[PDB]
Design a protein around this ligand. Structure first.
Ligand SMILES: Nc1nc2c(ncn2[C@@H]2O[C@H](COP(=O)(O)OP(=O)(O)OP(=O)(O)O)[C@@H](O)[C@H]2O)c(=O)[nH]1
Ligand SMILES: Nc1nc2c(ncn2[C@@H]2O[C@H](COP(=O)(O)OP(=O)(O)OP(=O)(O)O)[C@@H](O)[C@H]2O)c(=O)[nH]1
Ligand SMILES: Nc1nc2c(ncn2[C@@H]2O[C@H](COP(=O)(O)OP(=O)(O)O)[C@@H](O)[C@H]2O)c(=O)[nH]1
Ligand SMILES: Nc1nc2c(ncn2[C@@H]2O[C@H](COP(=O)(O)OP(=O)(O)O)[C@@H](O)[C@H]2O)c(=O)[nH]1
Ligand SMILES: [Mg+2]
Ligand SMILES: [Mg+2]
Lengths: 428, 430, 36, 51, 426, 425
């Protein structure tokens, strides 16, 4: 009855969303052609939150897909679940962006943005009582970062009080996979720190660390990595999707965990992760989850929070579990480690339980932690950005087609203040 | 929707293209008559169940083009898209740009407008030429003006054969490289450079073959262009389209010369012996023996490198392989451009042609970079242009062939200012 | 089999969900995956 | 049961890798036999020149 | 509701972590695939002390054992019990130490002590109430001495209140199989003596001497020498595994045999275990047991208290037994002599009795006879370390990983201190 | 996880390389097409199933690896790794080190870099060099000196072929001997000695193979290198890796040229009679009619004892044996290290190769006793180099191929300091 409109952006955005609708479908129990055939009706009583209905029970996912290169937009139409998105919603680009961000923002970004707005207001009129919007992109490319920043800039004209999340792919600290990446990344955050009410941070090499160490998978392709992050983005939007004992939807997660409106850069992780060796071995009780989420090793953004302090953390608990057990086992993470928790907030943790687990497991949980560790991330790009601006490296691919050099220096001041904002709240 | 047009100029452009389309007509199962019992990027469907590649072959001499029209491919090709001439340029930029090419420009442009009318979404051109002779300097420079005034924002990416230091064919090649580097600096969007003598130096040592011909060499150059364009049509985990390479390897419009190196050129007998992972192969392009450039980049510093992979290459094993290569002190980065890298992964394993000296190994990488070290290569070439022009040695044909002596001294100032631009880059900024 | 893809890294199930249930002497058979 | 699912998926991927190894063997053996054929043709032409 | 996390250090620690974990996992009856197969009621009492509760009801030994060279984790996994130790906690690096204390302490020993202290603090949070730790380790190796002492250095300040005993493995006097070990074994006892709560002497010469003269095994192995060390150290943790009549668990042994808190090096021994030709002619009774108890040829270290003086002597017992002839046959040997029986000690007896015996036998005993001849162990070493410190034996390897010259003099200066500390009661 | 590269240099380097690789190739199941992970220290898996050896060799007379392209093991040894030139060096450190050695150092070091970049878990390299040749001395020295800054702290060991006291091959072999001992005093982590004249004496006197060959000598070198470095592939009760060798073997940084002995060389016809028990035959590493390079440590002082063992070895019987060796006072241990020993124990018993006469023994014996009786050998070599460098025998070829004449007298006067370091005790 209250629902979320999914909307993707870029080749990385499309490839994430093809494995996000791949994992929400048969947890609701949906065949590859769109007819509900699941077991119990409890998954059916609020199927409308992420799905839409048509003639004869043929269900339609309501996601709005945009990409500029049509050679990889057809890759998800040929996938196993490619035949459930209605092909009116595919908004293809006739020519690619070229990984310069302002092409995605000014020259060939503004050409398609009339059409992408045409399908959402057609869809949002058909919505009953809309709640939020959901976005996936990578920062590293003009197809994903440039397009999304133009969408979120003037979606705040029409839908101001709708609660927006964006699930970014921040560039990895060791190897960033584009040469002229940090011009795009530093210019993206200025449209991020004022518009988006929440934003997440998924380091690409921190997921590589998980298949390095925890799962120790032999041969992980992007099908495996997209599945590891798609479970995390299902755990957030769940307490409005099933009943629970102490529920918490997107508004209750937002107003209860950011302290100040330009301080909202998050850091997620998903709790039960086990290799094939240790799965025969592993304990399964409620403090075994507090090992996983509060391990800095199991954290899908790169920076370890031993270098900084948490402000507020979140922990939603999908499962049928004792309430006291969670509550007892949350102070005992605060007490033995009280040097990584700030002092002008009395209690830090946020509690949420939902009865229905992921399909088969006993319990599962998702951690979202607002940290000052991320200034050690944001100090890196700002130094990385200055090394290519002062000597004017790769300048003319942005100057001659878009804005002048002031927009870079303005984006420095939008970036330098935030790193000073984190540090001032690191010791108050 | 992603149609790309390859135009071949000169003998070296068209003899590359004879082996180039042999590769493209085998990775798609095309009989050499033309039939076939996502290929529309390079091939054009007719109404009669027939495929024709979207290309234009242009030359100033019939003796190289008549074997195309009586070869084993004479019916796959369109009868008119092959263009001829009647009076040879004879190794002269003055003759390939002011005398002959002005009577053979009005038809080549006429066809390529129509060959873009089949398309809806064109994004790239491919001009194939060599910097040694007339038509490969004069005629290739004349068209780059003409494509630019008609198209503009289309990204035309090129392939060039450099005159090597030690070996040469002509004696008026060092004029014709400099005399085209003026006009083809304002009007080209990239420039790939592979010289003969560092295909010659590779082909003796890593392959068992000695004493080759250009049909063995163009099976490499045909493979290096197919390794670039393969991401357009075959789906992969990290695909990079052809219009992307401009903004990642060209920092400044005066510096648009990246270089090429294809790593697993090993014998079909010696494909048996080594494991070819991805961690073994991202280092081998930086080996001093294995570059197709006779400039050791140890003399310079790597500007930016783009890497592209084919076949069963996984993105976990390439991120671990690429982080190691900048941890060593052998491979050199400095402060002003510290990322440098972008990757390309494709799911099509590289095919083999009969008679090719390659092998069907499933992990092949091409390396695409520019260094600081090209500046010492031109340091011969501006010098060698001055040993001739100090007694105005071979300009005597050029003055009579329609252009004056005034552009030669202007070729000094434009080229000498390019050399100082590289040492502006290499000096540290503190 | 009711799987998205068997053997994905995070958890999956292949039992037929209609058979996992247990009743009481004073209640009807209720399914254990969806007991709230 | 999910333990067993992971184990059998790993076995399937190992099967595909062994298939890849056998087809590499196929291609290289065919190439080297054709190479031997051109070698013998060269020796034949040497005999004809001698006569 | 106390539970135990464990520590055994080395490939020798992994070798001890094979046969020591044989006897304990045998007696609480767990198969090599985890699920319960015992046949009594005491055998599901408190077996969350060593074992977690997994899914499916499987019982995994909560233990960490250390190495750094990768070829020593598999020859202990070739044993029958490689599927009960979950090898997540069995640690090794890419580069090994290799007879080098400095390599396993500063270089990558300090780099991977971050890993072992991210797991031993990970599972101790799941434990509702811990008890402590318990150790054996070789000394003449590199990682087992080095990372092993780095464990017990980086834990006596983060967890100082918990009790963490040791019973280390120092080697033989006359035949010694890696002889620059006073750079490895006498460095560590300066580290160890201000960290640990106990440390004893498990000498391979004394383990060798039993199969010479006592059990009549013609050709032994270390594996049947490693048999005799879980036949003794089970007796030190007999009460948290077996209910008792008068029990003495880990903390009561931690509080009743430490007079002066730096002085916890005594001489362990084991009274009952005779050959299969002497199995026919032998009773399960105390007075026939007492002949093979106090001899000069039956112990667990190769140092004789005939030179030494009886300070702290313990005796734990197995079996529902006659408990006045425990007292009758222990006072018929305190009332025989005045050279070893020191009259200054009024009476020191520490008695524990446990009900259910070890599996396969009915009655037993255990003993420790304390001495000033653990001083003469280190008295001999005090002229074998000085031989190769005056002449710079291998020290050019050692200064290359960030250390001082005086650290070897200072650790020797503590060693002459404690030898001087034993002679004040001598 | 402990992958190795064993580069052996010289004509000795190649022939000892392939006979030691013969005994390797029969102790694991190598069929010479490569098709058959405890092997994985010395072998390398391919993408086509092949187990390629990780061992490039050095030989500049091309007439030695002009064979190994053919023969039995032509598809076994991979010849892109084995590197030869087209112009020989011919008893010349100058030609080996910088004249003809200037242009293949790129290819050799590039190949070693490429293989050890393919690998992950190296520790070091095994090296055997012949003192008395052209390229087994010089390009070897260039390999040590350039690898010590290309890699650094990855180990490099050496167990050198050294000149005999009396009978030798070339004429002026001491020149190249000194011109490589100055560099192996600098960049060799360890360097023991095994020479061919002592193998002649031992194999002639005890086994009934009169008229032997360097191939038989290569086989006995294979037996000793197996019983040294056998434990990286075969598990043991008390085992050893490669790094423990450099850690425990040599006391002083400038003192790493000592000796050893290998006892059990007994034929099949004497092996069907004599019982070979770990106690009663390990004393044959001390008896004078047995030793490995011609020197008697009865004259000298025993320094250290790296014992190595394979087969049916008992800890009780090795300890009783070590006890009854340490009893009798031919053991002369002065105060500096009284204890001494190191013991290695290996389960897998050594392997019979067709071509020797040493039958399958059920248990073995080894030794590496660091000694003090090297001083008379190096002093005799001092005596005869002083006999030869008073009148400048062959100096003109060395000088004219690209150096100064101060190279000789800067390589010397290091050797007098070396024997001062050795006469200190
Ligand atoms: N890689 C490669 N280079 C070639 C080939 N054919 C010719 N060349 C090069 O071309 C250079 C000479 O220029 P050409 O292309 O032959 O002459 P041109 O540019 O066609 O000028 P004209 O012949 O007068 O029309 C020589 O240095 C060759 O290296 C070829 O098939 N492959
Ligand atoms: N024991 C043994 N020694 C060998 C063998 N092959 C060569 N040598 C040694 O090599 C010496 C003569 O060979 P060299 O003159 O050194 O040849 P090289 O320097 O090794 O290499 P090239 O000069 O390039 O052939 C003799 O003194 C032998 O000691 C062998 O198979 N076994
Ligand atoms: N997490 C994830 N990242 C991907 C995937 N495919 C590509 N990427 C990332 O996308 C980046 C390059 O894609 P690009 O087109 O430039 O990003 P886009 O503009 O947002 O589509 C690389 O840095 C990859 O890390 C995927 O399947 N999953
Ligand atoms: N008592 C006893 N000693 C052992 C055992 N295993 C090895 N050792 C001793 O440990 C010494 C070698 O230890 P080392 O391998 O260098 O230490 P590690 O690397 O930590 O295992 C030898 O002198 C052995 O006598 C054992 O099971 N029991
Ligand atoms: Mg021509
Ligand atoms: Mg030779």
């Amino acid at each position: 009855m209250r629902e979320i409109v999914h909307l993707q952006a870029g080749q990385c955005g499309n490839q994430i969303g093809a494995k996000f609708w791949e994992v929400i479908s048969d947890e609701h129990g949906i065949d590859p052609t769109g007819t509900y055939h699941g077991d119990s009706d409890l998954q059916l009583e609020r199927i409308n939150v992420y799905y839409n209905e048509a003639t004869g029970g043929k269900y339609v996912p309501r996601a709005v897909l945009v990409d500029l290169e049509p050679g990889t937009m057809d890759s998800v139409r040929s996938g196993p679940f490619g035949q459930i998105f209605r092909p009116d919603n595919f908004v293809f680009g006739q020519s690619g962006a070229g990984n310069n961000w302002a092409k995605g923002h000014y020259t060939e970004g503004a050409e398609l943005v009339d059409s992408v707005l045409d399908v959402v207001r057609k869809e949002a009129e058909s919505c009953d009582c809309l709640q939020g919007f959901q976005l996936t992109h990578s920062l590293g490319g003009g197809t994903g970062s440039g397009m999304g920043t133009l969408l979120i800039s003037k979606i705040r004209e029409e839908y101001p009080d709708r609660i927006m999340n964006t699930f970014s792919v921040v560039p990895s600290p060791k190897v960033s996979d584009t040469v002229v990446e940090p011009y795009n990344a530093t210019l993206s955050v200025h449209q991020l720190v004022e518009n988006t009410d929440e934003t997440y941070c998924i380091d690409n090499e921190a997921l590589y660390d998980i298949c390095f160490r925890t799962l120790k998978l032999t041969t992980p392709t992007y099908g495996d990595l997209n599945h590891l992050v798609s479970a995390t983005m299902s755990g957030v939007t769940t307490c409005l999707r099933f009943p629970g004992q102490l529920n918490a939807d997107l508004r209750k997660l937002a107003v209860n965990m950011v302290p100040f409106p330009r301080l909202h850069f998050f850091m997620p992780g998903f709790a039960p992760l086990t290799s094939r060796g240790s799965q025969q071995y592993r304990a399964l009780t409620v403090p075994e989850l507090t090992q996983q989420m509060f391990d800095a090793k199991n954290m899908m953004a790169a920076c370890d929070p031993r270098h900084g302090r948490y402000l507020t953390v979140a922990a939603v608990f999908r499962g049928r579990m004792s309430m006291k057990e969670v509550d007892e086992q949350m102070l005992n993470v605060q007490n033995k480690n009280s040097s990584y928790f700030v002092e002008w907030i009395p209690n830090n943790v946020k509690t949420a339980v939902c009865d229905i687990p992921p399909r088969g497991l006993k319990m599962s949980a998702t951690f979202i932690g607002n940290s000052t560790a991320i200034q050690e991330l944001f100090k890196r790009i700002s130094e990385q950005f200055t090394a290519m601006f002062r000597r004017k490296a790769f300048l003319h691919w942005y100057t001659g087609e878009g804005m002048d050099e002031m927009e870079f220096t303005e984006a420095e001041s939008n970036m330098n203040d935030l790193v000073s904002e984190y540090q001032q709240y690191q010791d108050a | 929707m992603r149609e790309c047009i390859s135009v071949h100029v000169g003998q070296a452009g068209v003899q590359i293209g004879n082996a180039c389309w042999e590769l493209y007509c085998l990775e798609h199962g095309i009989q050499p008559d033309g039939q076939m019992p996502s290929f529309n990027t390079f091939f054009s469907e007719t109404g009669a169940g027939k495929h024709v590649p979207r290309a234009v072959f242009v030359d100033l001499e019939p003796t190289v083009i008549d074997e195309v029209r009586t070869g084993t491919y004479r019916q796959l090709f369109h009868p008119e898209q092959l263009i001829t001439g009647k009076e040879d340029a004879a190794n002269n930029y003055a003759r390939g740009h002011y005398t002959i090419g002005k009577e053979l420009i009005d038809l080549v442009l006429d066809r390529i407008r129509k060959l873009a009318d089949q398309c809806t979404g064109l994004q790239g051109f491919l001009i194939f030429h060599s910097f040694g002779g007339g038509t490969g300097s004069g005629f290739t420079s004349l068209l780059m003006e003409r494509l630019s005034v008609d198209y503009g924002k289309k990204s035309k990416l090129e392939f060039s054969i450099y005159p090597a230091p030690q070996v040469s064919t002509a004696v008026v090649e060092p004029y014709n490289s400099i005399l085209t580097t003026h006009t083809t600096l304002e009007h080209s969007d990239c420039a790939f450079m592979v010289d003969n003598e560092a295909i010659y130096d590779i082909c003796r040592r890593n392959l068992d073959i000695e004493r080759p011909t250009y049909t063995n060499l163009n099976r490499l150059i045909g493979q290096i262009v197919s390794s670039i364009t393969a991401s357009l049509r075959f789906d992969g985990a990290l695909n990079v389209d052809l219009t992307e390479f401009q903004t990642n390897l060209v920092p400044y419009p005066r510096i648009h010369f990246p270089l090429a190196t294809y790593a697993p050129v090993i014998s079909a007998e010696k494909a048996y012996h080594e494991q070819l992972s991805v961690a073994e192969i991202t280092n081998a392009c930086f080996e001093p023996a294995n570059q197709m450039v006779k400039c050791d980049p140890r003399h310079g510093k790597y500007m930016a490198c783009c890497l592209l992979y084919r076949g069963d290459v996984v993105p976990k094993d390439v991120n671990a392989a690429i982080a190691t290569i900048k941890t060593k002190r052998t491979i050199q980065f400095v402060d002003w451009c510290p990322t440098g890298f972008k990757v390309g992964i494709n799911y099509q394993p590289p095919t083999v042609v009969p008679g090719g000296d390659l092998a069907k190994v499933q992990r092949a990488v091409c390396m695409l970079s520019n260094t600081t070290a090209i500046a010492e290569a031109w340091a011969r070439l501006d010098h060698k242009f001055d040993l001739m022009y100090a007694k105005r040695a071979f300009v005597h044909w050029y003055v009579g062939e329609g252009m004056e002596e005034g552009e030669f001294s202007e070729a000094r100032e434009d080229m000498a200012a390019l050399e100082k631009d590289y040492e502006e880059v290499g000096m540290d900024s503190v | 089999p009711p799987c998205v893809n068997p053997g994905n890294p995070v958890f999956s199930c292949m039992l037929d969900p209609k058979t996992l249930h247990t009743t009481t002497s004073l209640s009807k058979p209720k399914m254990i995956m969806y007991k709230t | 049961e999910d333990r067993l699912a992971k184990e059998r998926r790993e076995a399937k991927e190992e099967r595909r890798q062994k298939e890849l190894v056998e087809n590499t063997r196929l291609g290289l053996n065919a190439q080297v036999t054709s190479i031997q054929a051109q070698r013998q043709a060269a020796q034949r032409l040497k005999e004809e020149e001698a006569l």
